[PDB]
């Protein structure tokens, strides 16, 4: 059959709706070679980091903590490389990513969904149907935010104005 | 004609940092004799940034070759009648590998 997204491209054949958010889009054929659990692991991880980054880029413009000096987020990266806070964040992410390595091994061995860490403290996933719609929304937001974060950082480079101030000006 | 090429620096451990000799240009290191500096100047490199891009190009090619070896043994292995094409292989290795390679380098 044909891909739902691209009508004239054939369906990849490793993508038969097994993973939510599948629209049959995979022209370069990475699912014909590589494991889709690993690729969905990577898609959801990149997407969650990007979603947090876009929220951070905007909120950091709106507010910053009193103990830290006020500055733009790219300058924040460089300041906290030299200050020590960046190493703390890198270390704690690396610490969590150790048990993430264990989690990815559990996914490869079949006993875990690729983005599932059982992280539902506030019980928002009331029912299975609600979870399916929520994870479709998570996939769509994750992809959209990857595009968005690239835009903010690259535009900041080209025009040295922050995202809220760039919308505010021009 | 004054600075001596050096592209290897040793760590200080057991007194071995004596090997970082005064090669010139405000630098200490092991003098290298492979002629890479003269190759790079003939190429027109003129900066370390372009050497970083060449190192990345080598890393990308290295990944593509190890992928291709895996792919052509485990996923798509040619049959014997493909390898037993001496005329085709010579046509491509003379015309394509050597001739295009010389032409692209001439450009």
């Amino acid at each position: 059959d044909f891909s739902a997204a691209v009508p004239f491209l054939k369906r990849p054949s490793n993508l038969d709706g097994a993973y939510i958010g599948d629209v049959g889009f995979d022209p370069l054929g990475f699912s014909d070679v590589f494991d889709l659990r690993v690729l969905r692991e990577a898609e959801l991880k990149h997407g969650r980091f990007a979603m947090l980054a876009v929220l951070g880029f905007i909120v950091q413009e709106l507010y910053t903590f009193p103990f830290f000096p006020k500055m733009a987020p790219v300058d924040a990266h460089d300041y906290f490389v030299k200050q020590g806070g960046g190493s703390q964040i890198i270390f704690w992410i690396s610490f969590v990513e150790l048990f993430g390595v264990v989690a990815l091994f559990e996914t490869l061995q079949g006993k875990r969904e690729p983005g599932d860490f059982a992280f539902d403290p506030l019980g928002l996933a009331k029912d299975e149907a609600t979870l399916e719609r929520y994870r479709l929304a998570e996939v769509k937001h994750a992809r959209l935010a990857m595009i968005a974060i690239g835009g903010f950082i690259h535009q900041y480079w080209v025009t040295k104005q922050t995202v809220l101030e760039q919308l505010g000006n021009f | 004609t004054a600075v001596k090429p050096s592209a290897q620096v040793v760590w200080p451990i057991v007194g071995q940092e004596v090997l970082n000799g005064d090669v010139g240009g405000g630098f200490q290191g092991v003098q290298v004799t492979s002629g890479f500096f003269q190759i790079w100047r003939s190429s027109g490199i003129t900066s370390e940034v372009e050497l970083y891009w060449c190192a990345l190009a080598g890393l990308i090619m290295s990944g593509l070759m190890i992928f291709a070896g895996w792919f052509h043994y485990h996923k798509a292995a040619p049959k014997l009648e493909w390898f037993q094409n001496a005329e085709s292989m010579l046509n491509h290795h003379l015309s394509g590998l050597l001739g295009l390679g010389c032409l692209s380098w001439a450009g």
């Binding site: 200050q83 020590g84 048990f99 264990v102 006993k111 860490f117 059982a118 | 760590w11």
Partner: protein, 194 residues
Amino acid sequence: AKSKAVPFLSQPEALDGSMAGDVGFDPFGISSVIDIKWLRESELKHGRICMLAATGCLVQEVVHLPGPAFSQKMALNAWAAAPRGGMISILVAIGLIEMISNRFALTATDMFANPNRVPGDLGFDPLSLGANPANRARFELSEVIHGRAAMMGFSGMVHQMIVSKQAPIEQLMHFKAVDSSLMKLGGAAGNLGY
């Protein structure tokens, strides 16, 4: 069959909820390679040493034996100032305690040879405080928890004495934040040495 501590991982085998402090926390699966009896001996031993050590830092800050050799508020300085002869006496006494309390079954190959031997149970109850079997389970649990808490706390106290050259509660009462110019982490290979 998922872990209770780590809900997205499977419950590790050799962890069945029998032992006190068993919450299923073994993500790296050390218990699948190393026998759980040896691991519980080592956990109880580390924790007991740390419980005494954490109390040692705090009390050594407050109360001292007489004499100038024992007047070291900062505990990391007490190591160097306290008489060497007596410190090595402590070390030798610890070695004799280790061989006798374990009854010459000290090696990984021979300890627990006797089926009566229990992890952490050396027979130490001088005042028979564990005579009541009703209190046994919560005593075992609170010993395990005090040991874990004290491992973390002593680790913190030693490396905060390294960063700030102050005894722990005096550090709390005369607190100074890290400049970040000093105590740089790593960096031996970034500058290529020196």
